[PDB]
Design a protein around this ligand. Structure first.
Ligand code: HEM
Ligand code: HEM
Ligand code: HEM
Ligand code: HEM
Lengths: 141, 146, 141, 146
């Protein structure tokens, strides 16, 4: 479970991202597609070349859902219910992929927020992306 | 596929007793029922709304026979799974867009099916040989992904 | 989440296991030790030879715990509370290993319950074990 | 392991600027903080009750240096990680009883640390190559488990 300190740690880290959220989301997506090519099989309809507009636009969407998660950290299921429905019944993404995406987010954050990525913040952010993942795969069956 | 001679004959011995037709259909059907999201690849197959619809679906049964036929053919070339499966690999990646994790799930579902049909005969050591075989097969189908 | 149907299927399958449970647990453990050797690193103090007393004895303890969880299927987090603290703070078994044992428990049941291990039941059992695994793993950090 | 020539030069170039002292300390330290269960192997290191305690623990820092020391050797043996790490695999399995899944955890942490340190310079292409090295190292350390 996310502890109060975790919540504080995440609201803090995510605050600095501020307007760079769409950029970091896109970057994490890109890191994911190159580092773990099997993840590309869920986006056969996307132009996946560096900096193309489908990846940019999708990046913004992922990050915004994440901002929504942070802003509603104490009530994640309700807040992310619809995304949970989408991933479970429509996209049907294998759960193993949520970890690869989460790792790439963490790498992007560590690369972009040198001062803020302390070990404790690192721990909280990881636990946090795991909680989001769980919620997003909760209705699979 | 570091498979010892003892492991190799055990796999083969057992495989002899297998009815490839009914086993492949059983395995693929269960795959679709136990891990429902693996249905996303077979929307053209018709009704998959309930367990009996899936398990009794003729296209599921026909496709399972297809899958197992290739697996068998793979059991005849244990020292060269990658070569044997290369074209199937390219296909599942470039044309069909199947996340390789699905190959690992099928393997485990296949092990349950074998266990189910052979009971006591499916000893822990024989299970251990098959686990190596299904990973190897999973790995071979994953190998040409890019 | 486990549905009414799932709950029904689990009570029925485990109901037929009955007085074999312990033996099924020992077998499950033996299957895990041979198919996934890395799991052995958590048991360096055990004699792992076939037929071992410690195995048979640990086998029974595992089975008793699943019997209790099924006995409290609608209150599992509380019923397993103790087991959860043990695995998270003393034993500290890596989460992945829970999938390995679970798989080996299904194989064991598949091998012993031909008529009851229907597709629908296989599914429910898989969800159930995934739910147990999640509870035993919920307090890791 | 299938590392591309340009991938090879990408790994090597960046490693040339890595401060083993700092980075080894950070990686091991973070491992123990982000994944608390790993602390089970280092009870004799002393106080590990808090992040500051962990990050400050000098035995943690000394052992981190040693671990990256071995990692460095691997990078000059990329074409034979298995042989280069055979002995270390044996010790981690037979004397230490470390679940290999921990190797994977360390690799990922290692990857986050390099990013934290190099920022811009740790680009997606560079990350990709390091993900492969990290996995190869992990797989080589698990190789002699039995
Ligand atoms: C960190 C967890 C994730 C979050 C918060 C997230 C969020 C989102 C959002 C906001 C959308 C767009 C929904 C809309 O257009 O209204 C989306 C769609 C999608 N997601 Fe995820 N996602 C996550 C992980 C994943 C992963 C791991 C995969 C598989 C690799 C994936 C595959 C997809 C696909 C294929 C789409 C639809 C793309 C399209 O056709 O436009 N997602 N997700
Ligand atoms: C044991 C591993 C597997 C083997 C040996 C195998 C083999 C095959 C073969 C021989 C075909 C026919 C190829 C063709 O049409 O030219 C096929 C098609 C296909 N496979 Fe696989 N397969 C395996 C696992 C999977 C699984 C796990 C999935 C996804 C859950 C999958 C998805 C598909 C799909 C969607 C088709 C095409 C079906 C259609 O014609 O509509 N395969 N596979
Ligand atoms: C199905 C999920 C599991 C359940 C229900 C379970 C249950 C139990 C129980 C009842 C005990 C005995 C504790 C006591 O004496 O009070 C125990 C101990 C133990 N379990 Fe688990 N376990 C599970 C999964 C695992 C897995 C995945 C591992 C690691 C591979 C593991 C490793 C251990 C170890 C090392 C002990 C202590 C053995 C000893 O020192 O005597 N368990 N578990
Ligand atoms: C990147 C992969 C790793 C490498 C290359 C590595 C390398 C080493 C080396 C060089 C030693 C010193 C051996 C000696 O004293 O002769 C060592 C010891 C040890 N390693 Fe690893 N290690 C790795 C990962 C791990 C991790 C993930 C764990 C568990 C979390 C671990 C647990 C231990 C323990 C408990 C010792 C003995 C420490 C002591 O002397 O108290 N290792 N390892």
């Amino acid at each position: 479970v996310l502890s109060p300190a975790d919540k504080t740690n995440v609201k803090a880290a995510w605050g600095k991202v501020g307007a760079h959220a769409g950029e970091y989301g896109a970057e994490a997506l890109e890191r994911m597609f190159l580092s773990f090519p099997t993840t590309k099989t869920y986006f056969p309809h996307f132009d996946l070349s560096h900096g193309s507009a489908q990846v940019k636009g999708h990046g913004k969407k992922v990050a915004d859902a994440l901002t929504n998660a942070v802003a509603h950290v104490d009530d994640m299921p309700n807040a992310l219910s619809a995304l949970s429905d989408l991933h479970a019944h429509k996209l049907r993404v294998d759960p193993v992929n949520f970890k690869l995406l989460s790792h790439c987010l963490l790498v992007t954050l560590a690369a972009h927020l040198p001062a803020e990525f302390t070990p404790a913040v690192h721990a909280s952010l990881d636990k946090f992306l795991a909680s989001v993942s769980t919620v997003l795969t909760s209705k699979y069956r | 596929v570091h498979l010892t001679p003892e492991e190799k004959s055990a796999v083969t011995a057992l495989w002899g007793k297998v009815n490839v037709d009914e086993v492949g259909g059983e395995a693929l059907g269960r795959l679709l029922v136990v891990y429902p999201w693996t249905q996303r690849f077979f929307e053209s197959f018709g009704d998959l709304s309930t367990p009996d619809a899936v398990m009794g679906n003729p296209k599921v049964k026909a496709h399972g026979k297809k899958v197992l036929g290739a697996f068998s053919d793979g059991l005849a070339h244990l020292d060269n799974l990658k070569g044997t499966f290369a074209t199937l690999s390219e296909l599942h990646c470039d044309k069909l867009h199947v996340d390789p994790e699905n190959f690992r799930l099928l393997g485990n579902v296949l092990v349950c099916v074998l266990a189910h049909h052979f009971g006591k005969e499916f000893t822990p050591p024989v299970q251990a040989a098959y686990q190596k075989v299904v990973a190897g097969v999973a790995n071979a189908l994953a190998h040409k992904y890019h």
